[model samples]
Target: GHSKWANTRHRKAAQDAKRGKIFTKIIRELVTAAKLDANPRLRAAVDKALSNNMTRDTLNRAIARGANMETIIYEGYGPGGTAIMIECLSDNRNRTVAEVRHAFSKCGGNLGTDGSVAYLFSKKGVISFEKGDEDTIMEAALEAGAEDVVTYDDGAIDVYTAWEEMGKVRDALEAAGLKADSAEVSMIPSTKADMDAETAPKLMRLIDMLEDCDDVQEVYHNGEISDEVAATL
Candidate 1:
């Protein structure tokens, strides 16, 4: 956390790029670009390298290197279950992901959270971006069972879910970047207690048992059934 450069491999060398390190890279990329050989790009690189003060010997060497190029691909594992491949074809199939990482770090951009970036992604995704138009958000949500995202234009979002379908919708939402603000499951207690007549209630005992039960959480009553029902009781 001390430095933004942590986990950014070999990136402490960022200052290195500014000091003509990128200067060296520009020419090499042109050479590599030349090997991939589109006449236009090669000419562009030729003019570019020349303008950047490339020597004739260096220029000819690059040309010769490009001619002698070979193609190669290396298959490897990234971290744990991830798979990856690297191919560098020109003068050599050399620079692997490690060095490949070096250029990106120096590109004035970032290598990002895992050497990856920008996935054009989807899916019941609970749309709560914390900021946006409610109408626009609703329009986007209509694509799925959004069930009214309850978003306000002032950038507040309250998400709710059907208990059973929650996980599926939440998971899909994560994939879409329309993540949730909170999560929980709960029970509902309606006034289900009805009173009887002669004894107005054995129900009192039933209610008492529920109140004393170790597992009970909340209680309520819907006292007084119809007279006929009470009489039958």
Candidate 2:
């Protein structure tokens, strides 16, 4: 009766229907730019998108669309006095600003001046290892010129390097047989704010909403959730 085939078709359609379009669009732009040049900026953006499971087919389309977008960074303060940084790629500045502000307002956060929170973080190249032996990763990353190696509670290891050296370090690591889960140049916070259960969820909601926006590509915050709170989130 082909009922199994029908059911499989429905499942595929449902999964596609639930996916985010704006996120896909932003990622496409990054991929398109990466194809145009070996620009470190575009390469970092492409790597970040790929780390999240974006496909090459989609990336190819984004490249065909050409690289004619402006990259913007918005700074804001969130619940519990946390600093937030949002990165976006858009053709229209006014539209992007309005959408970002709307998300902030909806979440009880407000946008701030450019330098407001930028000083709280330093620009660095980050390569995350989701699964690897701690000692092995440390040795490989260090030998590849990483400045710092951090292990998270979730067993993820992060290798930090100078922003300019990110590409070289990433390539060297791969050549040495240590592939990264994700690699990008990003703003790393110098310090983070501890948030209680009540405040943590609100901040998470704000971040999620911001990321859902089509123009918003990356959101970084300095809100730290405790073990219990992280589990709930």
Candidate 3:
């Protein structure tokens, strides 16, 4: 029998690589923080964005978007009964919410109340390495005070750190000669729901729709996609 799971990291990176929404959001945050470029804070922001492949031009445009952007977190339940969290950066909250809600409903999901699905997740600093030896990465990350290291089926290694320690951890890794694939503050699920063939595609569509929304910065879901499903996706 073949594997039923999808290589979520590759698919996700492909999608994210094409979308600069997250970069825009990061720039907005940087500009809002009072233009401090001499040290840790600004350097950290730029480093994270650059790791995500954000180019100089895009970064400039994002800086121009300025500090007026609002950060919004949306909770929902996707197909296959998975809990979802959506992060958005927008100037208009009303429009963003309506668009997000519509995206969810269109894909057979519904928007949840503020605390609805959020309780199932925790906010953490996550850094991913696209290429690295698992044992080596674990040693470096753990030594740098990371809380945990997760290896995905697609050979990606994820390092988790306390929210406030993200920058410090990343700095340490770089000093130890390891550059990350991508790093950011992310919402991580405490539990996972396994999706079958019938429900997986629906959930993916829902995720795609949400990501395509201009205001949407990031989307997190708790669906444990099977290997066979991963192959198809």
Candidate 4:
């Protein structure tokens, strides 16, 4: 029990540090976007993907450019009563928050108190195994006490774990003969928010805005759009 708690604490710290590094990369992208694109809307779709690959020096230069990036958090209960967690990276915190708040307010939602809804989420270590006969990865995951494994069409399998078991499981997977596409700890919503197409786009737009913010590294929502709504997006 003691070891489990200690692992959770250490995992949390490590995850936070990793999240910070990710945020910095995102900030660099925002900075680069500022220098390259005319505005946020110009390259909104691929910003997150691009940011994950940014260099540290690039991030520092962006901050020096007075890009005004600050991590802004927004918590709210969105459609279908799902808890929504939003992270915004913006040079101007005020403007970003105002815009995000306005969006939720218009959606008949209001911001929530911290930890009010986060309890409905679980933190876990996730690793992706890309396609091609990775039977070795499968066998290793089982031996490492992985909670679950999901395989996708592109031949990628995602491995999940209890926070405490992450390092052990990951190390086992890597050492046992499997290559990981990526690995990180993330919170998965414990509850699901199902929605129709009519409101799905609106909710996504809100997500898009938060994602577009330069300082925001991740957005976790307790909502899972209905299949109809998902297909449209």
Q: What is the C-alpha RMSD of each candidate to the true structure, in Å?
A: 27.4, 8.6, 3.8, 11.4
User: Compared with the true structure, what per-residue lDDT tens digits does model 2 show for residues 167-228?
Assistant: 78888889988898778777888986887777877876787678777888667877755665
TM-score of every candidate: 0.24, 0.79, 0.79, 0.61
The candidate that wins on lDDT is 3
Whole-model lDDT values for every prediction: 0.39, 0.74, 0.76, 0.61
Let me know the TM-score candidate 2 reaches against the reference structure: 0.79
Q: Which segments of candidate 1 are over 4 A away from where they belong?
A: 1-140, 152-154, 186-233
Q: What are the clash counts of all predictions, listed in order?
A: 1, 1, 11, 4
Clashes of 1: 1
Off by over 4 Å in 2: 1-18, 31-38, 66-68
Query: In angstroms, how far off is 117's CA in candidate 1?
Result: 51
Tell me the deviation in Å of residue 141 in model 3: 2.0
Better TM-score candidate (1, 2): 2
RMSD of 1: 27.4
Whole-model lDDT for model 3 versus the true structure?
Answer: 0.76
Could you give candidate 3's per-residue lDDT for residues 31-129 as a string of tens digits? 644343334445546655776677878665655543366668989898989999998778899999999989877988888789998989888899878
lDDT of 1 by residue, 1-233 (tens): 11111111122243244435434544554666666765544554454455456677776677555645444433322221122223333443333334444432332212233322112111112323545455644544544455556544345564444544444555565666565543323222122223334333333333333323222222222232443443343
Collision pairs in model 1: 125-173
